[PDB]
Amino acid sequence: AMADIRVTHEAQVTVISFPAVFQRLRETEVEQIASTFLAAMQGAQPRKVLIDLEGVEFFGSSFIELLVRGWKRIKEDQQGVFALCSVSPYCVEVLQVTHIDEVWPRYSTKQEALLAMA
Amino acid sequence: ADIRVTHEAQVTVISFPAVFQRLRETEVEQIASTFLAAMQGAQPRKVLIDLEGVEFFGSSFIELLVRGWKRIKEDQQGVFALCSVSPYCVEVLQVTHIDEVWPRYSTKQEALLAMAS
Amino acid sequence: ADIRVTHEAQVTVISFPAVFQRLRETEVEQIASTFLAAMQGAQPRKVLIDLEGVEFFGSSFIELLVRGWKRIKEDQQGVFALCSVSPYCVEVLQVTHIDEVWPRYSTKQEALLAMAS
Amino acid sequence: AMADIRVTHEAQVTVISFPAVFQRLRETEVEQIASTFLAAMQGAQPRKVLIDLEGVEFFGSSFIELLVRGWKRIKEDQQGVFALCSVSPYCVEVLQVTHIDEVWPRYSTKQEALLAMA
Amino acid sequence: ADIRVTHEAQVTVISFPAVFQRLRETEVEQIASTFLAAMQGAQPRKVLIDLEGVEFFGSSFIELLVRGWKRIKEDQQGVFALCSVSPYCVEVLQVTHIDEVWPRYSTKQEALLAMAS
Amino acid sequence: ADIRVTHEAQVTVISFPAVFQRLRETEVEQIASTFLAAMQGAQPRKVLIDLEGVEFFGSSFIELLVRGWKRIKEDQQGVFALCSVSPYCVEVLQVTHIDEVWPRYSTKQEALLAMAS
Numbered sequence A, D: 001a002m003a004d005i006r007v008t009h010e011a012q013v014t015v016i017s018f019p020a021v022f023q024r025l026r027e028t029e030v031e032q033i034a035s036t037f038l039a040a041m042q043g044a045q046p047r048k049v050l051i052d053l054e055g056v057e058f059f060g061s062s063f064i065e066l067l068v069r070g071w072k073r074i075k076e077d078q079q080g081v082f083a084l085c086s087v088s089p090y091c092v093e094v095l096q097v098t099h100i101d102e103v104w105p106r107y108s109t110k111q112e113a114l115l116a117m118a
Numbered sequence B, C, E, F: 001a002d003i004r005v006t007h008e009a010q011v012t013v014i015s016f017p018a019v020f021q022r023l024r025e026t027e028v029e030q031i032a033s034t035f036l037a038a039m040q041g042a043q044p045r046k047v048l049i050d051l052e053g054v055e056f057f058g059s060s061f062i063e064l065l066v067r068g069w070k071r072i073k074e075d076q077q078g079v080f081a082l083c084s085v086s087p088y089c090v091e092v093l094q095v096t097h098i099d100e101v102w103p104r105y106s107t108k109q110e111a112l113l114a115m116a117s
């Protein structure tokens, strides 16, 4: 019954996407997805991960905290990459509160992100 | 549309009309002048940001609050407090450490009693 | 008043005079150009921010640090590190998640030695 | 109007105590007291701090987290001490979940704590 | 008094009578034998700890849960889940990292639907 | 199978063979006496726990580490440090707050050099 992120493998990148039921990511939603998300952070070096935020309209500290956990798992790979795409303008305003995303390249669409991460 | 500034119980109270449910860069610029003017009274300055009705904001609004707070914080006995912060707003404020030194109250009635001096 | 830039054990060390107990936007603006000028050394560039005596900073200092870090990280063999960061300042770095981006050491001698590995 | 911890100076130790209204320390109570608590962590080296938990019947992660913030502020003093006393049996069961209190000496009463910390 | 073990929808459900509002060392020893016996069924084992009515526990109970979980976790497709966890219990469980891999559900009805296989 | 104890640059280094990918209560019991025997060196005692290759541990390993730390910390000049700790394991240490008790380094060479300061 319980909704979850969807994890796809596209062009050597593990892509994390969100179903429509996850418009707003609070503490409850973050607990629901944490396990699938963190298990998707493994893979042969260099690991490349893209968080595709299309459809997501809100998040805050709980979700940023999860993303940081994912990033810490892959960040020691020399050519590892932890990227975002399709971030709504509001979610960008929330990201602007934190400084950590300065190390996560952000792209306007998945297609652009995938091409840049080849 | 602008914020509503009132003087209640020695406290300058900043409130938001319903139109400001979402506070993006545009809204922050609409209200910055009246907001910052409310930071300029007799010292020690006590300020209450009553966020009832406000459901979303980001860096723009936080930066305005911080700016107002830096005016008030000259005053050793000054207070810059928040009340009626919605759970969405809490989730955003938690992204930064800067707001921890602003006392939190559940409601305006509670804040004004707590802040009486 | 400005940052002190010294060269120790092949590391460019940035230190803060006593007057910078608090690094606010004002102080960050005073030191910005010397700081960024310090990021242009011979390769691989090793940089240590010795925060001894600094008791407060916030968002604008972090933004400056992130810039400098971005100039250094181009080096592959380069290191950008912090030491002697106060308990309050460590919290700021942890709450915004920027703490695990860079190595952080308790003391300068620990750092200078660690950074020779 | 708002209840707060009480901070006393006793025999060169900063003693933090709790009013009866704080039987149960959740997230809300921890926010109420954080500011007074953290401001009480300053003082000439060596700083000695005692958290007197008499009357407190419950706490969990939020309060332990605050205590850790206090402890980090004083822990670099070579003869610094961050101690607890008068911890109810239940609160000891909760402390047993965490490992950090293995570095905080615990004493059965304030009088005993103060004598040991001279 | 003992825990109540039932088999609902392929799931072994552990429930607590009202007398177990507080779970201290004594209570954990009262229930350990019936609890651990419920960890021994056909594989993959699915277990639900329905904590409705339970208001306080500490290390003793957490250690019992962990012990039961280590029996179940042999099973690659095994599940050890919690539901109806009170806010006091959440505050205690947050003190340790070990419980994060136990899924959480708000109610038993929700858990049993989620866990159906 | 047991821990490997080596002496490097005046530091007693504890390492784990490949088979200890997971340090549970069982593995913790196998290594406990060698580990504690390793804590009795010449003063000041410097000890490094090289956790390279360990992907999981929990409460009983932390308890062992805390014991060893308590034997070393008697030295005043002594150091007890960790390195090469996996991301999961760092979380365990942070959630129980034991991470800032000890220095933790990214690599062994970083640690051995840092610990000469």
Ligand SMILES: [Cl-]
Pocket: A007, A008, A009, A010
């Ligand atoms: Cl796929």
Ligand SMILES: [Cl-]
Pocket: D007, D008, D009, D010
């Ligand atoms: Cl006093």
